[PDB]
C-alpha cells in the first residue's frame, strides 16, 4: 500500500556523451544511456533523473545559474528540465543530430552544434509560467564545410570558437554589430581540430588538433593580424588527441588520448603537470571544475567515470558500470549494501546510501547466475556458470571457500541456510540438487527427485525447509535437517520459473509459464491462492517480428518474483517491459511499472544472427528496509523507493484532528495526544515537529502510554529518521524508552515489528557502534600516553 517511484540507477555511472561539472563544483552530471545521473561528490550521494528520452542521450549542459539542464538525444530531440525541482519543463525537436550543446556564461543564450551549422538560441525563462512555445532562435551560422567537433564560449558572452573537421578553427560574434571584431578563420592544423579556447584575457587563442598539435594565436603586427607565435606538439607514439578542455583561470589543459591516457599541461609554457592512464580504451569525455581543482574523465567502452584532484593527487570518485547486463541482485540483510552479478562473471558490492562500489570480485570465470546473503549477513554466496559456488566475506573481502561438483555441474540457482552451514545449488543439466557443508566444503549428498532441470531454490528463514521448483511441473519440500528426510511433491499446471518464499516460512509462491503466481501452504502442501498475470504484462513487438504483439507469446510469464517483507505483496519481473506489484490476500494488481522507454531497446514498443539488445529484468527483490525495491535489468539496477511521500494517507483521522490542534497540544504540553494525532494525520513534517519537541524528562512517560496500534509506526519512524539524523542520543533514548515499556509486546509479535526492529538495529549498529569505537580507542590510547613512562 505504498507508492514506489524511480530514484537512482546503480551499476551505471557513465555510458557516453559529455560529463559536466556543476557550477558550484560539488556535483557532477554524467549522462547514463537513456537518462542522466547526478553525483553529489561532497555529500557522496547520487540520484538519477526520472525523465526519460526516446533514445540514448548525446549531449548535455547545465547553466551557471544551476536552474536549467538541457539534454539532447541522438536524433536532436531536446528535453529542458528544472535542475532544482527535477521536473521536465519543455520538449523541443531540433530535427538534426546535435554534436554539442553549451549554455552562454551569461545564461541568456545557448549554442547548438548541428552538423556543419552553429545554431544559437534563446534560453527560456524559468521564473515565468510554463510557456507554450518558449524556444526562439537568435541566429544560425553557416561558415564551416565539415562537421563541428566542438564549440567554446567567450567569458563575456560575445564570441564563439567552433572547431570542425575542416582542419580550421572559426570565431564568430554573438552580437551582430561586433561581427567585424571576430570573423576570422584559423588554419594551419594538419588534422581535425578538437578544441579552440580563449585565454583569461581573451587576447590569446589556443587551438588543438587530433594529430597532437597545439597552436598559440596572437594578434600582432607583421597592420595587425592573427598569427601562430608558438607551436606545441604532443609526442604520443600513436595515441591521437581525442578530447580536450581548458580552464583559463588556472591555465590547465586536460587532453584525453585515444590510447586511454591523459595529460595535464600548463599553458603557454607547455609544462607536463602529470601523465596518467585510464586503460587501453579511448577517453570519451573530459571536464574541469569551476574552481579548476577537480578533473572528471570518462570513457564509453567499459564505462569509466573518475574525478581527479590533481592538487593533492587524490581520487574524489572512481566508479564503474557492468560491461554486461546484471543477472542477479542480493540485498544485505540490513539493506545497507546490495550485491550485483553480471554475465562477465565479476561481482560488485554497492552501498545504498552512497550508491558507490566498495569492492569488485573477479574470481568467477564465467557468468554468475545467482547471489544470496546468509541470515547473519557476514557471509556472501554466489554460483556461476563456470561450474563453481564460491564463498565470500564482506568484512575482510576475501573468498574463504569454493565449492564445485565432481563433474563440474553447471549451476544456475543457489540457497544458503539461515544457520549458514548448508548450501544447495541447482543445475539445468544434471536434474539433482548438490548439497555442501560450509564449514568443510564437502558434498554432503545430492537431492534427487526431479525429472526436470531445477529452476530455483530457497530455504525457509525460520523453519529451514527447502522448496525446489523445476520444469517437471512440480514443487518439492525437502526436510533435510533431522534424523529422517522427507520430500513432499506438489504438482503444478505448467513449468515453474521463479519461486519466492514467505519470511514466515508458512507459504511459498511460484511463477509458471502460463503467467500464474500460485501460493501453496508449506505445512499443508495445499494451494491457498492464485493470481493471473498474463494480461497485465506488457510486451512490445520487436522490429524483427513478423507477428503481432497481441498474438505473440514471447514473455507473458514472470521469470523472477519476490515477496514484500510485510508479506502482503510480490514484485514480479521477466523478459518484458513491465514490473507488476500484486497483493496476496485479494490477488489484485497494485501498480505496474515501465522498465524502459528507449526505442533502441527491442521490446520497448543465413549465418548471421539478427540479434540486438532486448529490455528484460533478470531479478527483483524488496529492500529489507521495506521502503524500496530494486530490479536487475540490462541498463542497470533500477531502484524504486517510497521516500518522497507527497501522498496524504491519514489513519483513523477525525474532525478534531488538525495540524493546528496538534501544535496547540504541544503548547499545552499534552505531548501524548500530539504524537498520536500527528500519526493519525501521518505527516512527516508534523511528526518530526512533535518528535523533537518532547523533553527528555517526558519521554519515558509518553513511551509507556503509546497505543499498541501506533507502536510499529513510531519504531519505523525512528529507525529511518535516526540513520541520517544528527540527534544520535535522542533517537537512542526514545529507542530505550519504547523498548523498555513495550519489550514484551514486540517479543509476542516478532513478525509485526520485524522490519521496524531491523531498521532500529541498522541505526544502533551501522552508525552508533562506530562512534563509540572511535570514542573508546582514544580513551585507551590516552591512558597509555599518560600512564606510560616517556623516553629518555
Amino acid at each position: 500500500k505504498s507508492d514506489f517511484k524511480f530514484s537512482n540507477l546503480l551499476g551505471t555511472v557513465y555510458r557516453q556523451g559529455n560529463i559536466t561539472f556543476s557550477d558550484d563544483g560539488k556535483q557532477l552530471l554524467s549522462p547514463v544511456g537513456n537518462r542522466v545521473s547526478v553525483f553529489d561528490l561532497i555529500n557522496n550521494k547520487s540520484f538519477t533523473f526520472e525523465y526519460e528520452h526516446r533514445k540514448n542521450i548525446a549531449a548535455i549542459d547545465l547553466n551557471k545559474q544551476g536552474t536549467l539542464l538541457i539534454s539532447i538525444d541522438e536524433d536532436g530531440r531536446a528535453i529542458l528540465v528544472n535542475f532544482k525541482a527535477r521536473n521536465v519543463l519543455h520538449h523541443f525537436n531540433f530535427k538534426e543530430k546535435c554534436s554539442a550543446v553549451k549554455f552562454s556564461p551569461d545564461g541568456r543564450l545557448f549554442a547548438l552544434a548541428s552538423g556543419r551549422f552553429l545554431q544559437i538560441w534563446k534560453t527560456p525563462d524559468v521564473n515565468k509560467d510554463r510557456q507554450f512555445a518558449p524556444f526562439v532562435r537568435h541566429r544560425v551560422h553557416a561558415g564551416h564545410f565539415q562537421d563541428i567537433t566542438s564549440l567554446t564560449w567567450s567569458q563575456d558572452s560575445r564570441f564563439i570558437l567552433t572547431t570542425s573537421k575542416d582542419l580550421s578553427a572559426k570565431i564568430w560574434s554573438v552580437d551582430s554589430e561586433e561581427k567585424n571584431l571576430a570573423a576570422t578563420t584559423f588554419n594551419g592544423h594538419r588534422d581535425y581540430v578538437m578544441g579552440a579556447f580563449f585565454s583569461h584575457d581573451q587576447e590569446k587563442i589556443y587551438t588543438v588538433s587530433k594529430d597532437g598539435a597545439v597552436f598559440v594565436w596572437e594578434f600582432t603586427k607583421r597592420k595587425y593580424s592573427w598569427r601562430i607565435t608558438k607551436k606545441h606538439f604532443f609526442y604520443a607514439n600513436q595515441a591521437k588527441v581525442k578530447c580536450v578542455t581548458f580552464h583559463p583561470a588556472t591555465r590547465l589543459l586536460a587532453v584525453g588520448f585515444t590510447s586511454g591516457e591523459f595529460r595535464l599541461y600548463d599553458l603557454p609554457d607547455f609544462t607536463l603537470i602529470q601523465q596518467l592512464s585510464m586503460g587501453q580504451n579511448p577517453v570519451n569525455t573530459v571536464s574541469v571544475n569551476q574552481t579548476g581543482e577537480w578533473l572528471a574523465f570518462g570513457s564509453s567502452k567499459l564505462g569509466q567515470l573518475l574525478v581527479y584532484e590533481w592538487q593533492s593527487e587524490s581520487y574524489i570518485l572512481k566508479q564503474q558500470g557492468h560491461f554486461d547486463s546484471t543477472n542477479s541482485l542480493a540485498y544485505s540483510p540490513d539493506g545497507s549494501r546490495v550485491v550485483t552479478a553480471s554475465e562477465d562473471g565479476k561481482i560488485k558490492v554497492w552501498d545504498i546510501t552512497s550508491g558507490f562500489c566498495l569492492a569488485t570480485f573477479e574470481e568467477h570465470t564465467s557468468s554468475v547466475t545467482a547471489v544470496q546473503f546468509a541470515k547473519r549477513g557476514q557471509v556472501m554466496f554466489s554460483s556461476s556458470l563456470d561450474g563453481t559456488v564460491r564463498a565470500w566475506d564482506l568484512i575482510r573481502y576475501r573468498n574463504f571457500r569454493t565449492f564445485t561438483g565432481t563433474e563440474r555441474i553447471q549451476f544456475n540457482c543457489l540457497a544458503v541456510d539461515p544457520s549458514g552451514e548448508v548450501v544447495c545449488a541447482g543445475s539445468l543439466d544434471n536434474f539433482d540438487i548438490h548439497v555442501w557443508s560450509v564449514q568443510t566444503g564437502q558434498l554432503l549428498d545430492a537431492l534427487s527427485g526431479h525429472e526436470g532441470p531445477v529452476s530455483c531454490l530457497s530455504f525457509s528463514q525460520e523453519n529451514s525447509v527447502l522448496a525446489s521448483a523445476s520444469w517437471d511441473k512440480t514443487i518439492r519440500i525437502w526436510s533435510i535437517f533431522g534424523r529422517s528426510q522427507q520430500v513432499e511433491p506438489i504438482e503444478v499446471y505448467s513449468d515453474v520459473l521463479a519461486l519466492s518464499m514467505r519470511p514466515d516460512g508458512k507459504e511459498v509462491a511460484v511463477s509458471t509459464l502460463k503467467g500464474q503466481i500460485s501460493i501453496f501452504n508449506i505445512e499443508d502442501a495445499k494451494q491457498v491462492g492464485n493470481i493471473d498475470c498474463r494480461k497485465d504484462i506488457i510486451s512490445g513487438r520487436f522490429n524483427q517480428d513478423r507477428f503481432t504483439a497481441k498474438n505473440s507469446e514471447r514473455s507473458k510469464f514472470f521469470t523472477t518474483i519476490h515477496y514484500s517483507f510485510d508479506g502482503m505483496a510480490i514484485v514480479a519481473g521477466g523478459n518484458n517491459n513491465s514490473i507488476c506489484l500484486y497483493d496476496v490476500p485479494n490477488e489484485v494488481l497494485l501498480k505496474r511499472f515501465i522498465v524502459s522507454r528507449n526505442m533502441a531497446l527491442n521490446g520497448t514498443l543465413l549465418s548471421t544472427r539478427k540479434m540486438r539488445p532486448e529490455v528484460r529484468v533478470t531479478s527483483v527483490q524488496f529492500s529489507p528496509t521495506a521502503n524500496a525495491f530494486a530490479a536487475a535489468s540490462t541498463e542497470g539496477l533500477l531502484i524504486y523507493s517510497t521516500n518522497d511521500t507527497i501522498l496524504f494517507d491519514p489513519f483513523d483521522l477525525d474532525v478534531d484532528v488538525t495540524p493546528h490542534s496538534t501544535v496547540e497540544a504541544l503548547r499545552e504540553k499534552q505531548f501524548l495526544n500530539a504524537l498520536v494525532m500527528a500519526f493519525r494525520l501521518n505527516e512527516e513534517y508534523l511528526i518530526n515537529k512533535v518528535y523533537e519537541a518532547i523533553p527528555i524528562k517526558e519521554i519515558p512517560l509518553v513511551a509507556s502510554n503509546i497505543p499498541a496500534i501506533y507502536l510499529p509506526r513510531i519504531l519505523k519512524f525512528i529507525g529511518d529518521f535516526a540513520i541520517e539524523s544528527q540527534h544520535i542520543e535522542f533517537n537512542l533514548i526514545w529507542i530505550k524508552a519504547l523498548l523498555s515499556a513495550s519489550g514484551g509486546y514486540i517479543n509476542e509479535h516478532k513478525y509485526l515489528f520485524s522490519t521496524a526492529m531491523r531498521s532500529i538495529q541498522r541505526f544502533i549498529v551501522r552508525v552508533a557502534k562506530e562512534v563509540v569505537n572511535t570514542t573508546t580507542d582514544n580513551k585507551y590510547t590516552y591512558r597509555f600516553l599518560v600512564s606510560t613512562d616517556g623516553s629518555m
Binding site: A182, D201, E203, F219
Partner: peptide
Amino acid sequence: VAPTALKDDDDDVLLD
C-alpha cells in the same frame, strides 16, 4: 590588441 579583448629577480648564485 585583439578585437576580442575584454572591454626583483633573485639571483640563484649563492655562497656555500
